[PDB]
Amino acid sequence: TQSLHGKVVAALVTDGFEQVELTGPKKALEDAGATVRILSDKAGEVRGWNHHQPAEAFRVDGTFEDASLDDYDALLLPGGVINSDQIRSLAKAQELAIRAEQASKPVAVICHGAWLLISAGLVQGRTLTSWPSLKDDINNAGGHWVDQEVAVDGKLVSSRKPEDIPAFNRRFIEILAG
Amino acid sequence: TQSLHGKVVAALVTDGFEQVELTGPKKALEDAGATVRILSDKAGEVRGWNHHQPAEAFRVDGTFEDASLDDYDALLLPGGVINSDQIRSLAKAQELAIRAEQASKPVAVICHGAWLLISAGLVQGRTLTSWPSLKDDINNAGGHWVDQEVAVDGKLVSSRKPEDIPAFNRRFIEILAG
């Protein structure tokens, strides 16, 4: 079984993130030996959601403003339409995603989460999947939208919905290990 | 002031629409003498939301499947991130908006509601505003995004947020009268 001991992943979330899109990948990554930190726009706690109902609050380990991608081997971008619509316009979240591309570090994204990638200018020429509502936005941004349980372009790992999470986790672990 | 007597407006909404972006314009049009029909994807009731909480239920006058634009002088597209994300993929909602473009009928859209126009191919070469989170999607789809309280491009009337509603209402009434 692949070990990710020593690996640190940053999950980028604002209030309204799909809770399982963080906790599923977080548990799979922790089971393999990695550390996962939660970064948000504000300090304190960030609220996850189960579909259209608010769910549990999670302790924020750090802010986008304060984060350095030197400290992380990869980014996790959970969906949640509310979180995804909010986070995509945040300059420091965009900067983290841009720095990950420049540094050839994995970015795992799921559901509505690729809006951050569109707005950071990062989907042009890349193949990814997403929740189908984002298909037009990704294609209009220059992306190559495909319908796959888990898409991979280099170290860009993408999935469309919560049911994809098990395969998403397995592929993200393979890509993080290299 | 301006009478809209004899005019009929279809508001296209799904569950999770921003309630005031329906009720505010609806009252203004009705005060002006117009009739406002609430159309949804499903019969019965459609759930309005107040920001991030579901709110009151509204009677559905007709479904997108059954609707003809022959019976409406204009479309009203309230926002709400949940509604706007859902409604954009429904071909029958896209059809109603395309028929509006083809028949030179006003379309008033606010906040997140322009996602449907993007997916219907209707923002190409158009000038419009929106909630800023859609800026990149509107520009990537060939639109010209502007930051105005109420933007107008022909009969396309667009606003950004609930505080724009009074001006949105006043402009819509003007465009509807012609």
Residue numbers in the entry:
A (entry chain X), B (entry chain B): 2 to 179
Direct quotes from the study:
PfpI is a ThiJ/DJ-1 family protein from P. aeruginosa that was previously incorrectly annotated as a protease. In summary, our data show that PfpI is a GSH-independent methylglyoxalase. We hypothesize that the primary function of PfpI is in the detoxification of electrophiles such as methylglyoxal (MGO).
Given that the predicted molecular mass of monomeric His6-tagged PfpI is 21.2 kDa, these data indicate that PfpI is likely to be a globular dimer in solution. Purified PfpI crystallized in the space group P 21 21 21 with two molecules in the asymmetric unit. The structure was refined to 1.4 Å resolution with an Rcryst of 0.254 and an Rfree of 0.274. Each PfpI protomer comprised an α/β sandwich containing eight β-strands and eight α-helices. PfpI and its close structural homolog, PH1704 (a protein with proven proteolytic activity from Pyrococcus horikoshii, and which shares 43% amino acid identity (E = 5.2 × 10–38) with PfpI), both possess a “nucleophile elbow”; a distinctive strand–nucleophile–helix motif and a common characteristic of the “α/β hydrolase” protein fold. In PfpI, the nucleophile elbow is comprised of residues 108-118. The nucleophile itself, Cys112, forms part of a constellation of putative catalytic residues, which includes His113, Glu22, and Asp86 from the adjacent protomer. The residues flanking Cys112 (Val-Ile-Cys-His-Gly-Ala) are broadly commensurate with the consensus sequence (small-x-Nuc-x-small-small) conserved in all α/β hydrolases. The X-ray crystal structure of PfpI was similar to that of YhbO, a well-characterized glyoxalase from Escherichia coli. Mutation of Cys112 and His113 in PfpI led to complete loss of methylglyoxalase activity.
